[PDB]
Amino acid sequence: EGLVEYIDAEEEESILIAMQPEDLEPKRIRVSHHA
Amino acid sequence: MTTFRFCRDCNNMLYPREDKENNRLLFECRTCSYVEEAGSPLVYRHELITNIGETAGVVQDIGSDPTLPRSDRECPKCHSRENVFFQSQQRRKDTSMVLFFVCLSCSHIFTSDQKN
Amino acid sequence: EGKRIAFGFVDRTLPHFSKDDYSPESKGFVENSYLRGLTPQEFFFHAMGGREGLIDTAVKTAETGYIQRRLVKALEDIMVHYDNT
Amino acid sequence: AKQNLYNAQGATIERSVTDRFTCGKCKEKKVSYYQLQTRSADEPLTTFCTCEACGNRWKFS
Amino acid sequence: ATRRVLQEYRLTKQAFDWVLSNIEAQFLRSVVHPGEMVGVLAAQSIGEPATQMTLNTFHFAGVASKKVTSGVPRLKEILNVAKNMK
Amino acid sequence: ASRHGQKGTIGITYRREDMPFTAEGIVPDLIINPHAIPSRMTVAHLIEC
Secondary structure: OOOOOOOOOOHHHHOOOOOOHHHHOOOOOOOOOOO | OOOOOEOOOOOOEOEEEEEOOOOEEEEEOOOOOOEEEOOOOOOOOOOOOOOOOOOOOOOOOHHHOOOOOEEOOOOOOOOOOOEEEEEOOOOOOOOOOOEEEEEOOOOOEEEOOOOO | OOOOOOOOOOOOOOOOOOOOOOOHHHOOOOOOOOOOOOOHHHHHHHHHHHHHHHHHHHHHHHHHHHHHHHHHHHHOOOOOOOOOO | OHHHHHHOOOOOOOOOOOOOOOOOOOOOOOEEEEEEOOOOOOOOOEEEEEEOOOOOEEEEO | OHHHHHHHHOOOHHHHHHHHHHHHHHHHOOOOOOOOOHHHHHHHHHHHHHHHOOOOHHHHHHOHHHOOOOOHHHHHHHHHOOOOOO | OOOOOOOOOOOOOOOOOOOOOOOOOOOOOOOOOHHHOOOOOOHHHHHHO
16 A cells, blocks of 8 residues: 555665654654754 | 867877978878868876865756755845755865755755855 | 764765764764663664674684784793803 | 975874873873773773873773 | 981881891892793783783774774784884 | 673572561562672663562
């Protein structure tokens, strides 16, 4: 259904990944990445 | 800046030759009879150290690379505030950390170093 | 190797960053503590830092052993005599 | 001439300044430090302290 | 020295004789005993810290502009009497 | 061995009478030394406990 994708160690050179899902919206120290 | 010149007959590069009785330079093809008249006494050039300003390299369709950062600086030409920015893409050891900005709309190149 | 975490990929250090990033948190800086907890990226960088020392021990054991044997074999027959020489 | 005279100099190894360790040679606490995970991970980090006033060096582990 | 004895220590005659005798006795027991195998002692003394030297060799690796050989490779080159140093 | 790189050997065994006890009559099944915590920085052992 195009919901997940298999990525090798070469295509990874041309992608961007948000580690937590909540990092995609606009204790420890977690920084808001500028991307 | 010396430029290669090809013979019009067989596409081979033209070798220089001298004309003593008229004292003039010519370009001849060693395979055929074509001879052409040299326009300048500059035939070869050998520089040693390159005083080349750093270049952003390929620019075409650079706005579709999603691993390239962004900035909100204002365009000096089209007055747009969205652009892509990156460091010099020539990989010399001693290159400075001077940025390069490519505008999103007008595709205009500029730098963060505004030296007069 | 005496430097910050170099660019393993092209113009970055990890797929979660952006090209040409020089911020400290992106080049292997851990601002947390063992009591607080480490985030994944600084955890990875800490892992590489530890791997370096592990390798160091595991091999230079053998090199030092060879040097020690050569040294002891070279000098094994030297003795203080009754002439004090 | 000024630029050449500046460019003929060597690398200055300026070390971190601190005032906690006491030197054993001149006892001036202006002793620089450097600490790293170098000893076997069975033991904690190793520090090396160098006095910037006299040139003394020592190690703590 | 005389001033040090009379002004800093204030020793008497008995204590002075005791100090001189004790100094001579403790010196005479420090000479090396004939028969000692000093070669293996020296080799062990030099090569035991060489085993631990590996750990902190790369501290100069913390300075990139100071890429000068020291540590295990430098000791190796000194021992081999290499004719082409790095 | 525990799950944090802290392993050892049994050095002596005691009976329930010589074991230090709490006010509730509980007794430690084993006793380890605290000189093993600082240089190893195994805070996860303490948190797991």
